[PDB]
Amino acid sequence: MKALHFGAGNIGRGFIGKLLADAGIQLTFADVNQVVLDALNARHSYQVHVVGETEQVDTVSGVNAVSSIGDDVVDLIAQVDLVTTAVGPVVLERIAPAIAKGLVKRKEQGNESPLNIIACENMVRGTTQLKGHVMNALPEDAKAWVEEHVGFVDSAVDRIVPPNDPLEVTVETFSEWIVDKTQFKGALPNIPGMELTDNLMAFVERKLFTLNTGHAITAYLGKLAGHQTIRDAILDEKIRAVVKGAMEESGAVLIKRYGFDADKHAAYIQKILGRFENPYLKDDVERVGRQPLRKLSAGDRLIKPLLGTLEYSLPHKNLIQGIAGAMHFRSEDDPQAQELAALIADKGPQAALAQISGLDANSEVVSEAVTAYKAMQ
Amino acid sequence: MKALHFGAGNIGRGFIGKLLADAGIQLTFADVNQVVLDALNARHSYQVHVVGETEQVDTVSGVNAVSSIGDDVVDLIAQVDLVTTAVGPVVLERIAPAIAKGLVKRKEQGNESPLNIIACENMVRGTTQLKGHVMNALPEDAKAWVEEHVGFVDSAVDRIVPPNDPLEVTVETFSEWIVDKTQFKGALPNIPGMELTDNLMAFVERKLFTLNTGHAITAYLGKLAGHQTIRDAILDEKIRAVVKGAMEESGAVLIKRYGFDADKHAAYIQKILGRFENPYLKDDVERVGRQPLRKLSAGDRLIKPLLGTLEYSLPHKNLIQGIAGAMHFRSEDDPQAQELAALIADKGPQAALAQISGLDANSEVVSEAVTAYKAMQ
Ligand code: NA
Ligand code: NA
Ligand code: NA
Ligand code: NA
Ligand code: NA
Ligand code: NA
Ligand code: NA
Ligand code: NA
Ligand code: NA
Ligand code: NA
């Protein structure tokens, strides 16, 4: 099997491309960074430091690379079995005309072997979003053929990969890659570390409501307590209790909503606490806490679980502490943190929280959050 | 009939709310800006300067307002026949928990009169996007009832409304408001100035490929020629020829793709040229040209029509001039224009264009654009 992966950044090299190459798939990266392209074509391999219990150095080999903006990438799309991405939303749109030209060429070459495309992005159903972009660049006369031969498979991915050698990358031991089984065309690939499900949204929300929720609250409370790193914060027993409790509160929602087994979910929470303890990552709380306006939005990792607890009459006291810690995040380098500070300064925490989150300013939850915010100054 | 409109900004007051109130609908605005809320509740009316052939002053009356973040807005959602928005993508998410709470209350009050929700946003199928946000905030036990009783109707809207009295607004005479007939629940409303179609995407693309394309190219070529305003630029016969020709080239694509009548489309192009001639707007080319990276993206108003001309073997020379003018846009106040300048400076126009647009750097169209770019310095 052959795969083309767009985005040879830390995620592409240390997680998605790594798993593809480790599976024995002939892997080509596509990128615009010439230094990374040349390094991959020069050495055909690189080292990934996989760190958690111990530091392991894994070697990824037999890889090569092409420019995402040239003609070779189009030729490859006409030949490979899988196309994956880890590029972010702006570049996810930019690669669409090359993918569309690739699909036209695939049809013109008479390659009817099923192709599956999997966007591995920090987005909900990113591959469906990519499909939208590809449709916007594909000729009408190719659309039927593409519907028949090409699967746009959504995924949910989770691996902590923080910021001489332009190819080395350090990643945590843990990873999760789950894809929607029902969208694949043809025989399902056997890629170790990739799991197929009929219920992708359950896993998307699990990750959002557990990993993202816990990680953010660890960062926000940690910064308030003067902790440098996620590890320092999670080993602080006062902070740990609130982080664990918030993931448990959000977990009761997931259990009710999706039917996850309670004992396995408890173990998944323990596994995430261990991930935060990683002694090799030295992940700055300021990095993890960045963009608090996004992280305080209605559909995101603090308000959505809270709305779930309201839906089911479940307890949210630790979530409320998390929201108050988020509201306290300050960073000179973060424009959202600046906007946040200015909004609370101008309108007060109650109006500010309502305006960012969409919670009614008169509500009991907003009342509870404002109390908690006041208590942390 | 009763309507609630979220977003009492220039678009809400001068276009969407104006048409609703002019139709005799009892209109309430929802916003977070207390000055605008108080002015609307104090005076219950305001003046809209409608300018084109002449300057007309219209009065909008019998309106009131509530906070989008309080409890009265929830009560209103349980009572009104229509909810409209003009808030932008960030606030479109933020209003979702209030809408969801409103729908729960609508069900709990036993109001089974059909409700239709229409987001009037500079987005493709914004109401479908809003629906996604509302679903993320609505209890599972309300979802069936909402599917039965509530329509989320996509729209395509077009009115040029550029930047003492906090309520007055100036708008061009022309407006267009088209909505997807097939998504309405119950009897269709009679709102003058709102048209219902089975084929909304045809109108979305028409506006993107004609108004947006023409308006952007007028701004970009105008700025290069030292013209202050859209009117100054469009009356420059050299610029006008390129703007008209680009809208015609994009128009041949729309005619082939959607079956628009060629004579009516020619007249629609003439109508847009007249809109650019408006002598009362004094619209700065720098404002209209802002965000060139967005405007040079694969799915946007310059590259998508170009891809269409490639699809159908149609002529794009004027589109190419437009792309080269966009690539020349400079503004200190515009971070994208800064990013653009830095990218061309670092990588050269060919690589820069390919990296922003997704066109193959080796392609003839990229070659043509680079020539044109070089010719304009
Ligand atoms: Na691995
Ligand atoms: Na295969
Ligand atoms: Na069980
Ligand atoms: Na309340
Ligand atoms: Na409450
Ligand atoms: Na009007
Ligand atoms: Na009605
Ligand atoms: Na005709
Ligand atoms: Na070519
Ligand atoms: Na070409």
PDB file of N, CA, C and O in Angstrom, chain B residues 113-134:
ATOM      1  N   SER B 113     -46.836  26.492  16.921  1.00  0.00           N
ATOM      2  CA  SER B 113     -46.808  27.307  15.689  1.00  0.00           C
ATOM      3  C   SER B 113     -45.408  27.190  15.091  1.00  0.00           C
ATOM      4  O   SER B 113     -44.438  27.306  15.820  1.00  0.00           O
ATOM      5  N   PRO B 114     -45.298  26.952  13.753  1.00  0.00           N
ATOM      6  CA  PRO B 114     -43.958  26.742  13.182  1.00  0.00           C
ATOM      7  C   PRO B 114     -43.070  27.951  13.388  1.00  0.00           C
ATOM      8  O   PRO B 114     -43.545  29.090  13.330  1.00  0.00           O
ATOM      9  N   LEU B 115     -41.813  27.687  13.727  1.00  0.00           N
ATOM     10  CA  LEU B 115     -40.813  28.747  13.869  1.00  0.00           C
ATOM     11  C   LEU B 115     -39.806  28.528  12.756  1.00  0.00           C
ATOM     12  O   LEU B 115     -39.396  27.392  12.480  1.00  0.00           O
ATOM     13  N   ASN B 116     -39.416  29.597  12.094  1.00  0.00           N
ATOM     14  CA  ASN B 116     -38.330  29.509  11.137  1.00  0.00           C
ATOM     15  C   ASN B 116     -37.209  30.429  11.555  1.00  0.00           C
ATOM     16  O   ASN B 116     -37.460  31.552  12.012  1.00  0.00           O
ATOM     17  N   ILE B 117     -35.992  29.920  11.426  1.00  0.00           N
ATOM     18  CA  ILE B 117     -34.772  30.632  11.836  1.00  0.00           C
ATOM     19  C   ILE B 117     -33.975  30.882  10.562  1.00  0.00           C
ATOM     20  O   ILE B 117     -33.796  29.966   9.781  1.00  0.00           O
ATOM     21  N   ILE B 118     -33.557  32.122  10.328  1.00  0.00           N
ATOM     22  CA  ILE B 118     -32.814  32.464   9.095  1.00  0.00           C
ATOM     23  C   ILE B 118     -31.586  33.275   9.465  1.00  0.00           C
ATOM     24  O   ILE B 118     -31.699  34.464   9.864  1.00  0.00           O
ATOM     25  N   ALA B 119     -30.407  32.651   9.363  1.00  0.00           N
ATOM     26  CA  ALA B 119     -29.165  33.390   9.575  1.00  0.00           C
ATOM     27  C   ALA B 119     -28.820  34.153   8.282  1.00  0.00           C
ATOM     28  O   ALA B 119     -28.776  33.562   7.198  1.00  0.00           O
ATOM     29  N   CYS B 120     -28.587  35.465   8.400  1.00  0.00           N
ATOM     30  CA  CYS B 120     -28.317  36.320   7.222  1.00  0.00           C
ATOM     31  C   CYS B 120     -26.885  36.776   7.371  1.00  0.00           C
ATOM     32  O   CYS B 120     -26.637  37.844   7.930  1.00  0.00           O
ATOM     33  N   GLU B 121     -25.951  35.938   6.920  1.00  0.00           N
ATOM     34  CA  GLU B 121     -24.576  36.075   7.274  1.00  0.00           C
ATOM     35  C   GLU B 121     -23.714  35.997   6.034  1.00  0.00           C
ATOM     36  O   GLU B 121     -24.140  35.470   5.010  1.00  0.00           O
ATOM     37  N   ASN B 122     -22.507  36.561   6.138  1.00  0.00           N
ATOM     38  CA  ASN B 122     -21.516  36.484   5.056  1.00  0.00           C
ATOM     39  C   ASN B 122     -20.789  35.117   5.177  1.00  0.00           C
ATOM     40  O   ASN B 122     -19.595  35.047   5.467  1.00  0.00           O
ATOM     41  N   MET B 123     -21.549  34.042   4.981  1.00  0.00           N
ATOM     42  CA  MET B 123     -21.113  32.658   5.139  1.00  0.00           C
ATOM     43  C   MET B 123     -21.933  31.825   4.171  1.00  0.00           C
ATOM     44  O   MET B 123     -23.030  32.231   3.803  1.00  0.00           O
ATOM     45  N   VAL B 124     -21.426  30.675   3.744  1.00  0.00           N
ATOM     46  CA  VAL B 124     -22.239  29.756   2.948  1.00  0.00           C
ATOM     47  C   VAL B 124     -23.080  28.854   3.884  1.00  0.00           C
ATOM     48  O   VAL B 124     -22.553  28.230   4.807  1.00  0.00           O
ATOM     49  N   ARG B 125     -24.391  28.846   3.660  1.00  0.00           N
ATOM     50  CA  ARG B 125     -25.356  28.123   4.491  1.00  0.00           C
ATOM     51  C   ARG B 125     -25.098  28.374   5.978  1.00  0.00           C
ATOM     52  O   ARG B 125     -24.911  27.472   6.798  1.00  0.00           O
ATOM     53  N   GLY B 126     -25.110  29.659   6.317  1.00  0.00           N
ATOM     54  CA  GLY B 126     -24.886  30.055   7.718  1.00  0.00           C
ATOM     55  C   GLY B 126     -25.937  29.508   8.667  1.00  0.00           C
ATOM     56  O   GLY B 126     -25.630  29.213   9.840  1.00  0.00           O
ATOM     57  N   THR B 127     -27.183  29.400   8.204  1.00  0.00           N
ATOM     58  CA  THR B 127     -28.203  28.884   9.108  1.00  0.00           C
ATOM     59  C   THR B 127     -27.962  27.392   9.422  1.00  0.00           C
ATOM     60  O   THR B 127     -28.224  26.965  10.529  1.00  0.00           O
ATOM     61  N   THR B 128     -27.506  26.617   8.435  1.00  0.00           N
ATOM     62  CA  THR B 128     -27.094  25.240   8.714  1.00  0.00           C
ATOM     63  C   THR B 128     -25.936  25.205   9.730  1.00  0.00           C
ATOM     64  O   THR B 128     -25.885  24.308  10.606  1.00  0.00           O
ATOM     65  N   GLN B 129     -25.012  26.166   9.636  1.00  0.00           N
ATOM     66  CA  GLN B 129     -23.958  26.267  10.644  1.00  0.00           C
ATOM     67  C   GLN B 129     -24.541  26.613  12.019  1.00  0.00           C
ATOM     68  O   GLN B 129     -24.176  25.989  13.041  1.00  0.00           O
ATOM     69  N   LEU B 130     -25.481  27.557  12.032  1.00  0.00           N
ATOM     70  CA  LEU B 130     -26.152  27.909  13.297  1.00  0.00           C
ATOM     71  C   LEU B 130     -26.870  26.673  13.872  1.00  0.00           C
ATOM     72  O   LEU B 130     -26.840  26.429  15.080  1.00  0.00           O
ATOM     73  N   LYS B 131     -27.546  25.910  13.002  1.00  0.00           N
ATOM     74  CA  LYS B 131     -28.253  24.712  13.452  1.00  0.00           C
ATOM     75  C   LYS B 131     -27.287  23.785  14.195  1.00  0.00           C
ATOM     76  O   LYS B 131     -27.637  23.266  15.262  1.00  0.00           O
ATOM     77  N   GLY B 132     -26.088  23.595  13.633  1.00  0.00           N
ATOM     78  CA  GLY B 132     -25.038  22.765  14.253  1.00  0.00           C
ATOM     79  C   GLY B 132     -24.743  23.255  15.663  1.00  0.00           C
ATOM     80  O   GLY B 132     -24.693  22.451  16.622  1.00  0.00           O
ATOM     81  N   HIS B 133     -24.589  24.586  15.805  1.00  0.00           N
ATOM     82  CA  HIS B 133     -24.307  25.166  17.124  1.00  0.00           C
ATOM     83  C   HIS B 133     -25.480  24.961  18.089  1.00  0.00           C
ATOM     84  O   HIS B 133     -25.292  24.676  19.273  1.00  0.00           O
ATOM     85  N   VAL B 134     -26.695  25.159  17.584  1.00  0.00           N
ATOM     86  CA  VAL B 134     -27.889  24.954  18.437  1.00  0.00           C
ATOM     87  C   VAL B 134     -28.007  23.500  18.917  1.00  0.00           C
ATOM     88  O   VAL B 134     -28.285  23.225  20.111  1.00  0.00           O
TER      89      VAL B 134
END
